[PDB]
DNA sequence: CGTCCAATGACAG
DNA sequence: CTGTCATTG
């Protein structure tokens, strides 16, 4: 019927509690909540190391100690030294968010997060939940959980549906279930060789993501509003520039309204459709195909970018700047990582604009460091190419990549017209899109589409690039056959993605899976290099400088009862690693970042890392030896 | 019938 | 509760 334990009886009950507790290696933790949402109100933690029994930690109801219990908890939760044990919570970064921000406890020990492992098994799996995992892993214990009906986040986060069950209850059941289940998961991960990949690689990534997510990133409303008004200027100015030819009662937002002037005064339609075709006209025709380009681009640049940023911004009083907080995600098929409260990965790229008298705007420039600080960005120079260069062992690609200069500029130079340089960015970007497309086996006609040429001609260009590099095609067909013989591919770490569709009869599913093996292997392995580089960087930064960890630990300082120095994790652009650092340590931080990124793992070529540095989100790059 | 890859979101019935 | 289109990587 029932087994749970409130731990308070005078002293001795709690005393033998901590006395057993201190001794144990593997153990489980979960917390719970009530109301008032940041929040400092947390009912209490709960701990279970196994069995039907479960232990609760409050914040019937007796009394001796008050702050004492909290000291005991702190002492218990970290790694005195030389003593190495692991700890599990359903999700991680937000529970750690709570422990650090709400109660001011910085948990530091070895970590295991069951949902991340769940993902490590099946990257294609959708967002595991407590019921999902206790269903799939710990069968015999499950029915109890159905008394609640909440599965999304932890049992604290499930406070509403649990509200009738809420209390020590949710935290305890979550604790014990998570423990037995994670013993099952760890068992399955060791049943493969993923465990090394799990505990010694990706959990640290979850951690680094967490202290990032506590850091946030800095923002400037003055710049945001300045460029806002600039975009308004181009908005209305392009409105009148547009309706200078005719205009008839127009507004751009309605495509049926566009159909008037579009289908009337031009008449070239090869509901009807919108995008691809008008890009096709963007190449050749001057009379306002591209007016729709600049307009629609401005529109996406404002309604889907300026607004959520300028909305969910918060301020860090500890700084005196306002900052915005993304969310750690993972759970990609490749193993790459994303962020959503907003997603600032996709933040728009700088582009030129006309009113000589031109102008240019950067939506992203609105991102600023703290007043004393500066922004350090570490870019990998064509990394995925270096990985593929490594596995195919095509010596030619190696030698081409060990030499030329932003080879995309060279491709554009010989392509749309011959210019040595003065290649515009969205041209370089289109060419990049195109080329990276070719490598993964873009279909001949679509390639002919983005380049603007005829099918069979483009196909002859594809056959041409096969002819240029044979190691690529070798490795390609080889890995296809291997994914047939296995039914999965494997990223360098030994994490493997399961492709069901490779063995399928239907030719589209078979084709999509064909390219999919390729991209999952190369990009997946890329994201693994990036992860290792991150956790390495932060791991050195941790002990190498004694100040403290992240801006959240400040709020931890206030709730625990100053200068600004360090460098702090901000963002990842997937081949880029994004830091803000006080302008003291910038050189030290730079060498450390460069070093750890290149020291991630050694391979057939060196991975050159461009390190850009400077004020805000736009920058200059040089370092000398 | 749909043949670059991986992400995130508004939009529509 | 699905597939498009916009951007980035
Ligand atoms: N398949 C594909 N991959 C892309 C595309 N854009 C970016 N990527 C991948 C390849 C490398 C990684 C970073 O791309 P970048 O835009 O940085 O290109 P890069 O190779 O890094 O050069 P640079 O960073 O100097 O622009 O993301 C694209 O349009 N298609
Ligand atoms: Mg790059």
């Amino acid at each position: 019927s029932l087994s749970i334990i409130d731990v308070a009886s005078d002293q001795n009950l709690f005393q033998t509690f901590i006395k057993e507790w201190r001794c144990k290696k593997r153990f489980s933790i979960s917390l719970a909540c009530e109301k008032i949402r940041d929040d400092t109100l947390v009912v209490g933690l709960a701990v279970c190391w196994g069995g039907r029994d479960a232990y609760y930690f409050s914040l019937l109801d007796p009394s001796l100690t008050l702050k004492d219990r909290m000291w005991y908890l702190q002492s218990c939760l970290r790694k005195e030294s030389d003593k190495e044990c692991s700890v599990v919570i359903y999700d991680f970064i937000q529970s750690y968010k709570i422990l650090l921000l709400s109660c001011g406890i910085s948990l530091e020990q070895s970590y295991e997060d069951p949902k991340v492992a769940c993902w490590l098994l099946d990257p294609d799996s959708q967002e595991p939940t407590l019921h999902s995992i206790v269903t799939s892993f710990l069968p015999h214990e499950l029915p109890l959980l159905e008394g609640m009906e909440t599965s999304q986040g932890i049992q604290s986060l499930g406070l509403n549906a649990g509200s009738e069950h809420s209390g020590r209850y949710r935290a305890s059941v979550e604790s014990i279930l998570i423990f037995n289940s994670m013993n099952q998961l760890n068992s399955l991960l060791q049943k493969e060789n993923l465990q090394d990949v799990f505990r010694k690689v990706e959990m640290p990534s979850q951690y680094c993501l967490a202290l990032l997510e506590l850091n946030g990133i800095g923002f400037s409303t003055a710049e945001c509003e300045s460029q806002k008004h600039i975009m308004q200027a181009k908005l209305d100015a392009i409105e009148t520039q547009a309706y200078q030819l005719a205009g008839h009662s127009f507004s751009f937002t309605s495509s049926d309204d566009i159909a008037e002037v579009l289908f009337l005064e031009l008449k070239l339609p090869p509901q009807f459709s919108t995008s691809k075709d008008v890009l096709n006209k963007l190449k050749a025709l001057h009379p306002l195909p591209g007016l729709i380009l600049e307009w629609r681009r401005i529109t996406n640049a404002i309604t889907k970018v300026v607004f959520p940023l300028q909305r969910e911004k918060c301020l860090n009083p500890f700084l005196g700047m306002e900052r915005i907080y993304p969310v750690s995600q993972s759970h990609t098929a490749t193993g790459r990582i994303t962020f959503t409260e907003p997603n600032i990965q996709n933040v728009p790229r700088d582009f030129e604009i006309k009113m000589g008298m031109p102008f240019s705007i950067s939506m992203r420039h609105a991102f600023v460091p703290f007043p004393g600080g500066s922004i350090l960005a570490a870019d990998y120079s064509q990394l995925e190419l270096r990985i593929l260069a490594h596995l195919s062992h095509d010596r030619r690609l190696i030698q081409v990549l060990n030499t030329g200069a932003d080879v995309f500029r060279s491709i554009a130079a010989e392509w749309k017209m011959i210019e040595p340089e003065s290649v515009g960015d969205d041209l370089r970007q289109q060419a990049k899109q195109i080329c990276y497309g070719i490598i993964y086996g873009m279909g001949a006609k679509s390639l002919g589409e983005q380049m603007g040429i005829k099918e069979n001609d483009a196909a002859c260009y594809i056959d041409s690039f096969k002819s240029r590099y044979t190691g690529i095609n070798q490795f390609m067909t080889e890995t296809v056959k291997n994914c047939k013989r296995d039914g999965f591919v494997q990223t360098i770490l030994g994490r493997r993605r399961y492709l069901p569709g490779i063995k399928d009869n239907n030719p589209y599913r078979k084709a999509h899976a064909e390219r999919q093996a390729i991209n999952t292997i190369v990009q997946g392995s890329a994201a693994d290099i990036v992860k290792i580089a991150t956790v390495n960087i932060q791991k050195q930064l941790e002990t190498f400088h004694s100040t403290f960890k992240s801006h959240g630990h400040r709020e931890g300082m206030l709730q625990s009862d100053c200068p600004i120095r360090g460098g702090f994790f901000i963002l990842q652009l997937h081949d880029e690693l994004l830091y803000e650092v006080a302008e003291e340590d910038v050189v030290q931080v730079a060498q450390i970042v460069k070093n750890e990124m290149e020291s991630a793992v050694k391979l057939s070529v060196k991975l050159k890392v461009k390190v850009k540095i400077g004020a805000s989100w736009g920058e200059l790059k040089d370092f000398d030896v």
Side-chain angles (χ1 to χ4, degrees):
Chain A
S1 306
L2 174 75
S3 276
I4 59 171
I5 295 177
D6 288 338
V7 181
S9 169
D10 268 339
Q11 291 305 116
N12 204 351
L13 178 140
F14 183 93
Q15 286 307 323
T16 191
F17 168 77
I18 61 100
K19 195 171 186 176
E20 281 283 329
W21 200 110
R22 292 173 182 271
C23 186
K24 305 301 168 64
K25 292 289 182 62
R26 184 181 294 274
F27 67 105
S28 177
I29 289 183
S30 167
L31 33 78
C33 270
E34 258 291 83
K35 52 255 199 71
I36 193 170
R37 192 203 223 257
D38 304 335
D39 51 337
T40 58
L41 211 275
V42 178
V43 278
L45 192 140
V47 157
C48 173
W49 57 70
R52 302 292 173 89
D53 306 341
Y55 304 142
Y56 185 69
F57 198 99
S58 66
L59 279 78
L60 299 182
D61 193 73
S63 170
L64 203 149
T65 59
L66 291 172
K67 190 176 181 180
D68 322 358
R69 66 178 82 88
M70 190 150 163
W71 182 87
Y72 265 109
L73 191 156
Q74 169 60 67
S75 171
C76 283
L77 260 65
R78 175 193 303 169
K79 202 169 171 202
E80 211 187 275
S81 277
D82 274 17
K83 240 69 162 68
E84 189 189 352
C85 60
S86 300
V87 55
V88 295
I89 321 95
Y90 162 66
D91 71 356
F92 181 77
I93 78 160
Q94 77 185 22
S95 295
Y96 185 75
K97 273 202 288 181
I98 294 175
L99 296 192
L100 190 69
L101 271 54
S102 169
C103 288
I105 297 160
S106 174
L107 172 58
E108 181 182 0
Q109 271 170 157
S110 300
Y111 299 128
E112 294 178 351
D113 196 74
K115 70 184 300 179
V116 180
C118 174
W119 169 84
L120 191 60
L121 301 177
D122 186 9
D124 279 336
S125 166
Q126 298 294 324
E127 278 298 331
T129 54
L130 273 77
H131 193 51
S132 171
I133 295 172
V134 68
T135 305
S136 178
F137 292 109
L138 184 60
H140 221 275
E141 303 296 328
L142 78 88
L144 179 59
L145 174 54
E146 288 193 350
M148 297 183 189
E149 189 193 2
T150 168
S151 290
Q152 40 195 24
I154 64 183
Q155 290 308 101
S156 83
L157 188 143
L159 58 94
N160 197 31
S163 183
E164 293 182 352
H165 301 289
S166 178
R168 48 174 179 178
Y169 192 64
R170 287 175 293 105
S172 299
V173 60
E174 180 180 356
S175 70
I176 167 184
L177 257 59
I178 281 175
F179 189 89
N180 284 271
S181 179
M182 175 63 199
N183 214 347
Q184 282 296 103
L185 289 185
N186 207 37
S187 172
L188 264 60
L189 267 65
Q190 182 174 355
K191 187 175 292 295
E192 209 152 1
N193 200 333
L194 292 186
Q195 188 169 356
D196 280 338
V197 191
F198 168 67
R199 62 172 184 175
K200 294 294 186 289
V201 175
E202 198 151 8
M203 280 305 301
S205 175
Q206 276 295 307
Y207 168 86
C208 199
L209 282 173
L211 76 89
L212 177 168
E213 200 269 350
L214 286 178
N215 272 333
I217 175 182
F219 188 80
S220 171
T221 309
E223 191 74 13
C224 171
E225 188 169 2
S226 175
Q227 291 183 154
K228 180 198 301 173
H229 293 166
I230 296 173
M231 286 187 181
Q232 188 178 358
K234 190 70 167 177
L235 179 79
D236 287 343
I238 286 309
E239 190 266 345
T240 57
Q241 172 67 263
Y243 307 147
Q244 190 178 0
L245 281 179
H248 197 63
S249 299
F250 286 144
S251 184
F252 309 79
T253 58
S254 177
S255 176
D256 297 340
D257 189 74
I258 298 171
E260 181 82 17
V261 62
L262 175 61
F263 298 165
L264 263 54
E265 288 189 350
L266 217 132
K267 188 191 58 57
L268 185 57
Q271 265 173 339
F272 250 86
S273 208
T274 39
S275 181
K276 332 231 201 310
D277 263 28
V278 70
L279 179 68
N280 206 264
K281 235 168 69 191
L282 162 145
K283 316 265 213 177
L285 210 56
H286 293 296
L288 285 59
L291 185 136
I292 313 303
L293 170 81
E294 59 187 339
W295 199 90
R296 292 264 233 123
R297 194 181 177 86
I298 287 182
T299 291
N300 187 38
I302 171 177
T303 190
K304 289 183 183 297
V305 177
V306 178
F307 283 99
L309 286 180
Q310 208 172 1
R311 174 196 175 278
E312 58 183 328
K313 69 172 67 176
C314 297
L315 61 93
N316 257 335
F318 310 136
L319 280 76
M321 81 185 303
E322 57 189 352
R323 293 174 67 86
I324 197 173
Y325 296 86
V327 178
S328 167
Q329 184 54 55
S330 304
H331 246 277
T332 48
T334 59
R336 187 176 286 190
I337 309 172
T338 50
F339 313 108
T340 156
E341 268 307 315
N343 194 349
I344 47 189
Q345 291 173 331
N346 75 343
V347 289
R349 182 201 220 76
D350 318 348
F351 66 88
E352 295 165 347
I353 190 174
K354 286 184 289 294
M355 290 180 176
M357 189 175 282
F359 190 63
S360 60
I361 59 175
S362 311
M363 261 305 304
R364 54 179 60 200
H365 180 278
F367 293 172
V368 292
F370 61 91
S374 294
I375 302 294
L376 177 139
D379 187 284
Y380 272 124
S381 197
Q382 305 111 4
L383 174 133
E384 298 191 4
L385 300 184
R386 302 180 178 278
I387 296 184
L388 178 50
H390 168 71
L391 275 82
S392 75
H393 289 287
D394 180 80
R395 52 158 188 76
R396 181 170 190 174
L397 167 59
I398 299 289
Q399 281 297 97
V400 175
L401 187 45
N402 260 292
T403 166
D406 266 6
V407 67
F408 310 98
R409 300 182 174 183
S410 292
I411 292 175
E414 194 70 18
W415 185 239
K416 277 197 72 65
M417 190 52 65
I418 178 167
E419 296 289 319
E421 205 48 37
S422 296
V423 177
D425 171 82
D426 231 288
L427 181 56
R428 181 174 193 275
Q429 190 68 78
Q430 188 179 185
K432 191 187 295 182
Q433 226 112 199
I434 286 170
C435 192
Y436 270 99
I438 296 170
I439 302 164
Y440 293 140
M442 180 121 149
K445 72 178 304 170
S446 187
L447 173 61
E449 173 67 19
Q450 286 184 337
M451 284 167 163
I453 67 170
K454 276 65 185 177
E455 179 196 1
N456 48 22
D457 193 73
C460 194
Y461 190 83
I462 289 176
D463 188 12
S464 175
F465 267 168
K466 173 198 172 297
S467 181
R468 303 273 277 183
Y469 321 102
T470 57
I472 301 177
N473 202 125
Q474 172 184 356
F475 169 72
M476 188 171 291
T477 51
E478 279 292 320
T479 205
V480 171
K481 184 173 177 291
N482 277 275
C483 199
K484 275 190 173 181
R485 87 169 71 177
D486 283 336
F488 62 91
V489 304
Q490 201 166 165
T491 62
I492 296 175
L493 296 187
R495 175 190 67 259
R496 64 190 67 186
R497 180 193 183 182
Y498 293 79
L499 273 172
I502 190 64
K503 207 170 185 180
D504 175 67
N505 193 32
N506 190 328
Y508 168 71
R509 299 180 173 178
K510 181 179 174 180
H512 173 58
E514 282 183 355
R515 302 182 302 276
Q516 206 163 5
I518 304 173
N519 103 270
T520 283
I521 283 183
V522 50
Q523 288 191 357
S525 296
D528 294 335
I529 284 177
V530 170
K531 285 178 177 176
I532 291 171
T534 58
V535 298
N536 282 4
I537 290 183
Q538 178 59 56
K539 187 56 165 289
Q540 187 156 357
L541 259 60
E542 196 163 7
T543 186
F544 190 76
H545 277 77
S546 55
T547 63
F548 55 97
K549 186 169 308 301
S550 70
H551 298 159
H553 298 74
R554 305 288 189 90
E555 217 260 326
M557 173 70 186
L558 182 134
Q559 203 67 78
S560 184
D561 278 346
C562 294
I564 309 169
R565 183 178 185 168
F568 291 146
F569 189 38
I570 295 190
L571 189 153
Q572 81 154 223
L573 299 173
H574 303 168
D575 68 330
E576 225 151 62
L577 277 188
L578 261 197
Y579 291 120
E580 71 180 345
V581 44
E583 175 199 3
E584 299 178 352
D585 311 340
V586 286
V587 186
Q588 298 181 341
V589 172
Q591 186 178 358
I592 287 170
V593 172
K594 168 186 164 63
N595 190 32
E596 285 307 328
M597 281 178 67
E598 296 180 351
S599 292
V601 270
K602 198 64 188 298
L603 54 97
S604 298
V605 289
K606 56 182 176 179
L607 320 175
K608 194 179 81 177
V609 178
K610 294 161 59 182
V611 175
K612 296 178 181 178
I613 191 178
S616 166
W617 211 165
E619 291 149 0
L620 280 64
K621 170 191 68 64
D622 202 67
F623 285 99
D624 59 343
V625 63

